Design a protein around this ligand. Structure first.
Ligand SMILES: O=c1ccn([C@@H]2O[C@H](COP(=O)(O)OP(=O)(O)O)[C@@H](O)[C@H]2O)c(=O)[nH]1
Ligand SMILES: O=c1ccn([C@@H]2O[C@H](COP(=O)(O)OP(=O)(O)O)[C@@H](O)[C@H]2O)c(=O)[nH]1
Ligand SMILES: OC[C@H]1O[C@@H](O)[C@H](O)[C@@H](O)[C@H]1O
Ligand SMILES: OC[C@H]1O[C@@H](O)[C@H](O)[C@@H](O)[C@H]1O
Ligand SMILES: [Mn+2]
Ligand SMILES: [Mn+2]
Lengths: 276, 276
């Protein structure tokens, strides 16, 4: 038993809550979490969360993991996949029931561009995800959960609105604009500017996306060019041509230090941790 | 190249455009049809449309079919399935390319309750739909198309808001309220009141729904009760427990004679034809 939705009273009148291809844009006030939780529990949903913690970024794991335990898919099955060059540095964090963590040991790439960039290659490690989880959520590790992040996000394919660019026009989007690059998006094209720090979907859709972006980055390399924002450029080219089935609002990727807390954000759910 | 969606300017601020389980509610102004058409054409989508024309209701087929040719899934593959007791009375209507019509001969049930009611049994004729179409759309025949009805509606499972009840509270919903009936919905339960005249989905979801409603009506019969609005009662019980993935606005099921043309309806797409 819950409040009756009323067709002639919108939830939110201040923000766009659906894209022009009829994908929900997920804001507080758009969903009843009780309904969604029941739907996902009935399927015994398992959500995998992938995080890279290479070199000094192992320092961010403790708060990342502690805060995920408090706010991320609570009540559902969760499998954390920690990709690191330092397995001994992964902190032991006590997990709730139905939750588990695996440490995947990987190589440390020399430059930060290639660390960020090789995530796509590294996520795509294929049949282990297909058997173990229903959805994959791929995030930066230099972050903390401050409020609910739940099954409202889950769908075949989702991206997240970049918090610096949601109120902006498309010509201002820092898409890749050199036609030499696989990430190239013309000045008159574009729906949104998605951030590379939080995307996901079904295992099948995430494997497609990561495979494509990896294949697209190798083509750029063989051609002597590096997309202007690296994986995020290719992520934006993919999601232009294969549109997400949900879009997360900036409630899901924010920085209060840089941007404050505007009234249009009723919750700040997943935020940046200060770094040098 | 199309207008950029703007996250801080909603399309429609006058109506709810998403349900609390994050299913789009389809109103004019929520979708860009150019995007949707390309997505569905890329999959070579075929849409089946089922219509019963038993006894005197063969008189409605000509206008139904002529108007569908003008407004229903134009540019896409369409297969009409005309269920009738009078195959010779089906009018020959000239079809656009990629469009076809089959006549399925059925028995005429004695009462109108059972004619309306046995559609569920009759739709569920199973493997022929699975092979021939991707989606099934199930409508009344006493109607005409007056404006676009397209791939914006397509999704795994959809119902349509009853035009008499969209502005109403749930206690006013004419759900079945006797616990004796499989269609029983408590006074404090309910999202919307859907009309039996326009529902659909993927072939798999429509076969599930029609099978369930058929199984539920047989149980009611064996127990000596007939749901208050017959198939529509069971349709509402199904869609309460298995929530639709899109909901169509009343633009998709209207009667201008009874209800006029209110400002909140920017288009009147599929309407009732006067009958005695
Ligand atoms: O030395 C590094 C650099 C990057 N990262 C990973 O790559 C992500 C993206 O890089 P970063 O957070 O530095 O990018 P930014 O948020 O500053 O643009 C990080 O969150 C980590 O998951 C890493 O593990 N070690
Ligand atoms: O004698 C009948 C009665 C009903 N119908 C079919 O059942 C649908 C629902 O019945 P009707 O339209 O009479 O219901 P209403 O719209 O008046 O509630 C009709 O549209 C036809 O498709 C039919 O073919 N022959
Ligand atoms: O223009 C895109 C850039 O926006 C910055 O605000 C952000 O720190 C970068 O990571 C990148 O997303
Ligand atoms: O209360 C439900 C009823 O509403 C009437 O307006 C309609 O004609 C009936 O077919 C049935 O839907
Ligand atoms: Mn980061
Ligand atoms: Mn009718």
């Amino acid at each position: 038993v819950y409040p009756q939705p009323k067709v002639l009273t919108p939830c939110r009148k201040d923000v766009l809550v659906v894209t022009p291809w009829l994908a929900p844009i997920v804001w507080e006030g758009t969903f009843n979490i009780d309904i969604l939780n029941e739907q996902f529990r009935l399927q015994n949903t398992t959500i995998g969360l992938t995080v890279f913690a290479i070199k000094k970024y192992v320092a961010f794991l403790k708060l990342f993991l502690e805060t995920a335990e408090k706010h991320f898919m609570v009540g559902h099955r969760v499998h954390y996949y920690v990709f690191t060059d330092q397995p001994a540095a992964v902190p032991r964090v006590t997990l709730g029931t139905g939750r588990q963590l695996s440490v995947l040991e990987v190589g440390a790439y020399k430059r930060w561009q290639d660390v960020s960039m090789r995530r796509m290659e590294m996520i795509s490690c294929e049949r282990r995800f297909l058997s173990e989880v229903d959805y994959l959520v791929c995030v930066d590790v230099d972050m903390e959960f401050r409020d609910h992040v739940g099954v409202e996000i889950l769908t075949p394919l989702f991206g997240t609105l970049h918090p610096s660019f949601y109120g902006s026009s498309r010509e201002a989007f820092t898409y890749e604009r050199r036609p030499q690059s696989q990430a190239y998006i013309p000045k008159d094209e574009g729906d949104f500017y998605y951030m590379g720090a939080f995307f996901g979907g079904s295992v099948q859709e995430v494997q497609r996306l990561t495979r494509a972006c990896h294949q697209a980055m190798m083509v750029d390399q063989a051609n002597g060019i590096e997309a202007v924002w690296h994986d995020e450029s290719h992520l934006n080219k993919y999601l232009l041509r294969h549109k997400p089935t949900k879009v997360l609002s900036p409630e899901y990727l924010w920085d209060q230090q840089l941007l404050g807390w505007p009234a249009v954000l009723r919750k700040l759910r997943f935020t940046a941790v200060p770094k040098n």
